[PDB]
Every structure is written in C-alpha cells, then in structure tokens.
Amino acid sequence: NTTHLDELVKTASLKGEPSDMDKAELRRRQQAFGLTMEDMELILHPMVEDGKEAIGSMGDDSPIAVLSDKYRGLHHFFRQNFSQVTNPPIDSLRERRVMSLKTRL
Amino acid sequence: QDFAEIYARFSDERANEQANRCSQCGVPFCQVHCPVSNNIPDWLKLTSEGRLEEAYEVSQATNNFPEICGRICPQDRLCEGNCVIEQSTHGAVTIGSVEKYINDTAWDQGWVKPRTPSRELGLSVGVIGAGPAGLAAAEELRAKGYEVHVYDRYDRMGGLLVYGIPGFKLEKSVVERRVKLLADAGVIYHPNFEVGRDASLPELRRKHVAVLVATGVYKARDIKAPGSGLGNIVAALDYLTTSNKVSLGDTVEAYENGSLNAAGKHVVVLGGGDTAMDCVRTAIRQGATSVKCLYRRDRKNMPGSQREVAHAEEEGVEFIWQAAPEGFTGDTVVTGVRAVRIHLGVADATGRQTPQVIEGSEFTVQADLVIKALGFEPEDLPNAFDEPELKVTRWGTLLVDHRTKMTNMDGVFAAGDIVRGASLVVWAIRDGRDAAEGIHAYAKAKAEAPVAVAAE
Numbered sequence: 001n002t003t004h005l006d007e008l009v010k011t012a013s014l015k016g017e018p019s020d021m022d023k024a025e026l027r028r029r030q031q032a033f034g035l036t037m038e039d040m041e042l043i044l045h046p047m048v049e050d051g052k053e054a055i056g057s058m059g060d061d062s063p064i065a066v067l068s069d070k071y072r073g074l075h076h077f078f079r080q081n082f083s084q085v086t087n088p089p090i091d092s093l094r095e096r097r098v099m100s101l102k103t104r105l
Numbered sequence: 106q107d108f109a110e111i112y113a114r115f116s117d118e119r120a121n122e123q124a125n126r127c128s129q130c131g132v133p134f135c136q137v138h139c140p141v142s143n144n145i146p147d148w149l150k151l152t153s154e155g156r157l158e159e160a161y162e163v164s165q166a167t168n169n170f171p172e173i174c175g176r177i178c179p180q181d182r183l184c185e186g187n188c189v190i191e192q193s194t195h196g197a198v199t200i201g202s203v204e205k206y207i208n209d210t211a212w213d214q215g216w217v218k219p220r221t222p223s224r225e226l227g228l229s230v231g232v233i234g235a236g237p238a239g240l241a242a243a244e245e246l247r248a249k250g251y252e253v254h255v256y257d258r259y260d261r262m263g264g265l266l267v268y269g270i271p272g273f274k275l276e277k278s279v280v281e282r283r284v285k286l287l288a289d290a291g292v293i294y295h296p297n298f299e300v301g302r303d304a305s306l307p308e309l310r311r312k313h314v315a316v317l318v319a320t321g322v323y324k325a326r327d328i329k330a331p332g333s334g335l336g337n338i339v340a341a342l343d344y345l346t347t348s349n350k351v352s353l354g355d356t357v358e359a360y361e362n363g364s365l366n367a368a369g370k371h372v373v374v375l376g377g378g379d380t381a382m383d384c385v386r387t388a389i390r391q392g393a394t395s396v397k398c399l400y401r402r403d404r405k406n407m408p409g410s411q412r413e414v415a416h417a418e419e420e421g422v423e424f425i426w427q428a429a430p431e432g433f434t435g436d437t438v439v440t441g442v443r444a445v446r447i448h449l450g451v452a453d454a455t456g457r458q459t460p461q462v463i464e465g466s467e468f469t470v471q472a473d474l475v476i477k478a479l480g481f482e483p484e485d486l487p488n489a490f491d492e493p494e495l496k497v498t499r500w501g502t503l504l505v506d507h508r509t510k511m512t513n514m515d516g517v518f519a520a521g522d523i524v525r526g527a528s529l530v531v532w533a534i535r536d537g538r539d540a541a542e543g544i545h546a547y548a549k550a551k552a553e554a555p556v557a558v559a560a561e
C-alpha cells in the first residue's frame with residue numbers, strides 16, 4: 001500500500017536535470033554564502049567526477065569558526081559526534097547492506 | 106658581444122607543458138610567497154587551458170608590471186621558493202616563466218585596459234619618478250578614478266627596469282607595454298621634471314592633494330674618488346645606462362652612435378648583488394676579454410640569488426671570492442691616464458663575525474676597467490631638501506609607516522627603493538600598491554567620503 005515515489009522521481013532526472021541560472025547569477029549567489037574556488041575545484045568536482053569525497057591531508061590548522069575572520073557557515077560550528085568507548089562505529093563500506101537511508105513522508 | 110635572451114626561465118608555447126605539470130595546489134604556498142599575492146594556481150590553470158588572456162588578466166590585476174616581474178623576479182627567494190613540487194624530481198614550477206609567457210601573448214593581442222566607472226574623482230595627485238613603484242601606485246589610483254601625473258627626471262621611463270637591468274634579461278618593449286597599459290588609464294607622465302630645484306613638496310603643496318615619492322636611490326657608492334670613464338672607472342650607475350641606451354631601441358630617440366661602450370681587456374666588477382652580476386655580464390657584451398667579480402665577503406654569502414649568479418658563472422666570469430671579510434679595494438692605480446690595477450687587502454671573519462681587513466696581505470690585480478657595483482643610495486642634497494618637512498630616519502631615507510607607507514606628512518607617501526627596505530621590482534610595485542589604497546583613503550577623506558577598511 002506504499003507509494004514508492006522513486007521511479008516516478010528518477011524518470012524526471014533522466015528527463016533532464018535542469019539548470020536555470022546564468023553564470024552571472026550563480027557567482028553572485030555563491031558569493032552570498034562565501035563559496036570559493038577551492039570549494040569548486042577541491043571539493044565539488046571530485047564528488048561529481050569520482051562519485052566520492054575529497055580525501056586530503058595534514059591537520060586542520062585554520063582558526064575555529066567563531067574566532068574566524070572570514071564568513072563561515074552555520075554548519076562549521078556544528079561538529080559531528082562519533083562514539084568512542086561506549087560503542088563501536090560501523091563499516092559503512094564493508095557493511096553497507098545493514099545501513100540505510102530510506103525516507104518516508 | 107650582443108644581447109640575446111639569456112634567461113633560462115623564458116618559455117615558448119611549450120609553457121603548456123609546465124602548466125599541466127603544476128599541481129594547482131590549494132592555499133598555494135607560492136602565492137602566499139608572492140609579494141603582490143598573485144593567484145598563481147588560477148593563472149597557471151588558465152595557461153594550461155590555453156586561455157592566455159585569462160591568465161594575463163589574473164596576473165595584471167595583482168601586479169601592474171606582471172610582464173617585467175615574470176622575467177625579473179628572484180623567484181627562488183619568492184613564490185617559487187615555497188613551491189610544493191620542489192619536493193619532486195622535476196623540481197619547482199617556473200612560475201616566473203609561465204607568468205612571462207601568458208603576459209607576452211597578451212601583449213601580442215594588443216588589448217587596451219579599461220577604466221572602472223568612477224570614484225572621488227581626483228584632485229591633482231603627483232608622483233615623482235617613473236619607476237615600478239610610481240607606475241604601480243599610479244595605475245591603482247587610476248583604477249580608483251583619479252587624475253594623476255608622474256614627473257620623471259630622465260627622458261626615458263621605467264626606472265631601473267629601463268636604465269640598468271640588461272636587455273638580455275629584460276627586453277625594453279616589455280617595459281613599454283606596461284607603461285602604455287597604465288597610460289590607457291589616463292595617467293600622464295612628463296619627462297624632464299625633477300624633485301629638486303624645479304619641483305619640491307612645498308611647490309606641489311601649491312595645489313596638489315597628495316604626492317608619492319617613487320625616485321628610488323639615484324646615486325652610487327664612494328671609494329673611487331674622482332676617477333673618470335676615460336681613465337677606466339665607471340660606476341654601475343654610469344655603465345649600465347650606457348649599455349642600455351645602445352642596446353634598447355625604444356629607450357631613447359637618439360641612436361647611441363657612440364655605440365656600446367668599448368670595454369677592452371680585464372674588467373674588475375666589485376659587488377655581491379644583482380648589480381655586480383649584471384655589470385659583469387654586460388661587460389662581456391661590450392667586448393671585455395675577461396671579467397673578475399670581486400667580493401669583499403665569502404662565496405657562500407653572495408647576495409644575488411642562484412639563478413642570476415648562474416648567468417655570470419656560465420659566462421665564465423671568475424669570482425675571486427673568499428672569507429666573509431672584504432677582499433677590499435684599497436686603491437686604484439692609474440698610469441698612462443688609464444687604470445692599470447686595483448689594490449686590495451684580504452679580509453677574514455673572526456668569531457665575532459665582524460669583518461677584519463688584514464693590511465699585511467695585499468693583492469695587486471691587474472685590470473684595464475673597473476666598474477663599482479656596491480649599490481646605490483640617496484645623497485643629493487637638493488633632492489633631500491625637496492623633501493622637507495618629511496622626517497628622515499637615521500638611514501637618511503624618508504621614514505614611512507610600513508603599512509600605510511605614509512610619510513610624516515599625511516599628504517605625502519613613499520615607496521620602492523627610496524624606502525630602503527626592499528630591493529626587488531615586485532616589492533616596489535607592492536609598495537605602490539599598498540600606498541595607493543592609503544592615498545585613496547586620505548583623498549577620499551578630503552572628499553568627506555569614507556573607505557571601508559577592507560580596501561578593494
């Protein structure tokens with residue numbers, strides 16, 4: 001009795017992920033939220049190309065967002081939690097079949 | 106004898122090869138290491154794509170003299186010094202070369218550089234000296250939208266770039282290209298005006314909002330005493346320019362029919378820095394049989410960076426060079442109304458590392474020609490007088506705030522070699538760069554209009 005609006009949704013993607021902004025706009029919005037080239041080159045790109053995420057190296061030695069000089073987005077202040085001794089983390093690669101991302105409305 | 110492009114760095118379209126090589130690194134070290142803070146990853150990426158105009162634009166935005174700097178910048182000391190690829194077998198990217206190339210194509214295009222719409226328009230602003238510092242300051246100011254005039258003592262423009270740095274390293278057409286781009290801005294240059302009897306800061310005060318003192322270090326160092334060119338002696342100040350005039354076509358209307366200076370027999374060049382090495386190389390250009398570069402100090406502490414010393418070395422110039430202390434020239438002997446030799450004393454470094462000259466040990470070096478490379482400094486008293494009231498430091502140079510580059514007088518700013526604090530084209534252009542924002546803040550205040558802080 002459940003409507004899986006999946007196929008219905010894939011359909012329209014194959015029918016054309018649409019774009020509607022002219023590079024003159026794109027850049028200014030982007031600018032609003034301080035986006036950058038590092039942002040498009042370092043990070044966005046590999047996601048599209050490889051279907052995967054920018055791996056990098058060495059520490060993070062930028063200031064902490066509140067102490068930053070430059071505009072930094074909310075998400076920078078929200079740090080992700082992880083579990084240490086109380087519980088173990090999972091292998092999302094080797095054990096992907098147990099995880100899941102199903103969403104219901 | 107002749108001035109071909111000796112630069113190793115120069116690149117043909119083949120620059121494409123290195124452009125691809127560049128890692129195009131994030132928060133690149135090279136840019137941080139660049140005085141003007143050029144966005145090297147982006148301009149390089151651009152050349153990789155082959156869109157030379159894009160890289161050229163990126164280069165020019167940060168430095169007005171992108172061409173000259175690409176050719177001249179002591180990169181190892183500068184941006185290339187922190188190039189990450191240096192860790193690799195291939196070695197660091199020759200950023201200077203790619204900058205030259207991208208710039209060169211742009212020159213070929215013949216595009217003119219337009220003005221941004223408008224700003225506090227411009228009470229008269231004056232800049233003294235046509236060199237890198239003033240040109241940079243003037244162009245940024247014009248970008249702001251001001252009316253400005255640069256008063257140049259000499260008939261030629263470009264400063265040391267034109268006068269001294271050799272054609273083989275720095276083609277004259279290069280400096281001409283940049284000045285023209287600046288000119289498109291509407292900056293006006295007038296050639297036979299000098300900050301001295303003719304022009305003074307108080308004279309300028311007669312109607313003039315602000316002034317930038319760009320004149321550099323006009324004179325050279327002392328020991329030669331009245332010695333004449335006919336006899337033998339030439340200061341770098343004298344020598345380089347004569348070679349420049351004969352060698353570079355646009356520089357002067359008159360053809361130096363006298364031709365290149367006739368330098369024959371052994372030439373002794375005294376100096377550790379860029380000046381000495383350029384004179385050594387230029388000397389062979391004028392027919393010198395042999396050139397000796399004498400250093401007071403030790404070989405290890407040669408002032409010029411390795412790339413330039415390399416040019417002299419390949420050239421086969423001999424470096425008599427030892428001990429941190431001065432092979433120091435005691436005296437020049439002239440017989441026959443011509444210099445036969447120069448007398449030196451050996452010097453050596455003590456634990457104190459303070460230099461010692463040992464009188465007992467002397468060297469008589471035979472030489473037909475001596476060129477003194479030691480350096481330059483301001484000493485012309487009327488020039489200094491021109492400068493009043495502005496405060497001078499105990500280095501006898503105009504004091505300026507490092508950030509603002511403002512002089513004791515709020516209206517007057519200074520930058521470049523005159524500041525005595527940097528001795529590179531890119532730092533001089535940077536000086537003008539930084540000054541321009543501050544002159545702008547000052548003038549706008551006069552306008553009663555604010556400037557943010559961020560500057561842009």
Ligand SMILES: Cc1cc2nc3c(=O)[nH]c(=O)nc-3n(C[C@H](O)[C@H](O)[C@H](O)COP(=O)(O)OP(=O)(O)OC[C@H]3O[C@@H](n4cnc5c(N)ncnc54)[C@H](O)[C@@H]3O)c2cc1C
Nearest residue numbers: 234236237238258264265299300320321380521522529530
């Ligand atoms: C031989 C030599 C080789 C060099 N090689 C290099 C190199 O390879 N790479 C590099 O980065 N740097 C090099 N430099 C340094 C570089 O040339 C200088 O740092 C730079 O040109 C300084 O710019 P500037 O505008 O301050 O002064 P310049 O000294 O460049 O400009 C001063 C201008 O003021 C004019 N002037 C002088 N007195 C007056 C007055 N009283 N009134 C009006 N106008 C006046 C002069 O005629 C001149 O046009 C070299 C310098 C020398 C001497």
Ligand code: SF4
Nearest residue numbers: 127128130135188189
């Ligand atoms: S972006 Fe700069 S010149 Fe290129 S590899 Fe050398 S450090 Fe990265």
Ligand code: SF4
Nearest residue numbers: 139174178183184201
């Ligand atoms: S202007 Fe900056 S220091 Fe000279 S990136 Fe170019 S050659 Fe290097």
